[PDB]
């Protein structure tokens, strides 16, 4: 009970039935709901059976398309779970069909419904993790390029650097913004927003520092030490914030084989 919904999307999908089931689990250990005859679900159940097959199909396709190795190994197991719990639901239906007061058939409905719900969540979680894993890479990439900042000594380089980092800094910003907007734990969202913003505010600051540097370089006018410090400090603080973001992201999207 009370799942770990990470994004609003998933929750808006699982929350409904997750409740219809939780409100029912309470109707067993302390109530044992049993009496009302259940009309043949040969139809309604069919509705789920069909959607389950469709789901499984898409997942099998998602595996072929995907490149993430964890997904190719985590999803397949989920397919079965949703398919297995579904055969149970379908059976529990024909059971009630012949006998609407069958108690055992009532059990098949619950166990099968929770199985389908759990099998689904696992599928969505896996997928989400892969998505997040895509962001971490992008983040790890920006981190790396910030390292090259200390190699730029000419305006020609500075121009190059800016044209490469800028686009990157945008993709990450886009991914981060589109991420926090889905997060459900207001706690993690604050860290992401503040971090990303701080990083966006430092970029222009980084460039300027580098510019001032390359300017002092080819110029009789001494005073270049303090320039390297500001540039270096920016990278350091920027890097800190990015490492912060990565971490917050890995809190739930991490697996033993994260390669």
């Amino acid at each position: 009970h009370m799942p770990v919904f990470h994004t609003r999307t998933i929750e808006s999908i699982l929350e409904p039935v997750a409740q219809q089931i939780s409100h029912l689990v309470i109707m067993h250990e302390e109530g044992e709901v049993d009496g009302k005859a259940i009309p043949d679900l040969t139809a309604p159940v069919a509705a789920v059976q069909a959607a389950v097959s469709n789901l499984v199909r898409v997942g099998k396709e998602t595996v072929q398309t995907t490149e993430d190795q964890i997904l190719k190994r985590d999803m397949p197991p989920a397919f079965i779970k949703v398919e297995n719990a579904c055969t149970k639901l379908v059976q529990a239906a024909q059971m009630l069909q012949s006998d609407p007061y069958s108690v055992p058939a009532r059990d098949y409905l619950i166990d099968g419904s929770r199985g389908i719900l759990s099998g689904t969540s696992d599928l969505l979680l896996t997928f989400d993790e892969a998505e997040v894993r895509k962001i971490i890479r992008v983040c790890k990439g920006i981190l790396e390029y910030l390292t090259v900042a200390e190699v730029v000594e000419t305006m020609e380089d500075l121009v190059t650097y800016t044209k490469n980092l800028g686009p990157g800094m945008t993709k990450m910003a886009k991914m981060i913004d589109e991420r926090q907007q889905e997060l459900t734990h207001q706690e993690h969202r604050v860290m992401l927003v503040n971090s990303m913003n701080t990083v966006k505010e430092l970029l222009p600051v980084l460039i300027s520092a580098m510019k001032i540097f390359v300017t002092t370089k080819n110029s009789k006018n001494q005073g270049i030490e303090e320039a390297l410090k500001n540039r270096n400090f920016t990278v350091e603080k920027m890097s800190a914030e990015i490492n912060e973001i990565i971490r917050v992201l890995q809190l739930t999207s991490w697996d033993e084989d994260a390669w």
Binding site: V17, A50, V52, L55, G59, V82, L117, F127
Partner: peptide
């Protein structure tokens, strides 16, 4: 994307199934 679409279908059709128990 298309994964979230199918997922809802599952939960939707399964909602109208459990609803007939309350």
């Amino acid at each position: 994307n298309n994964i979230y679409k199918a997922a809802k279908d599952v939960t939707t059709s399964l909602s109208k199934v459990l609803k007939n128990i309350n």
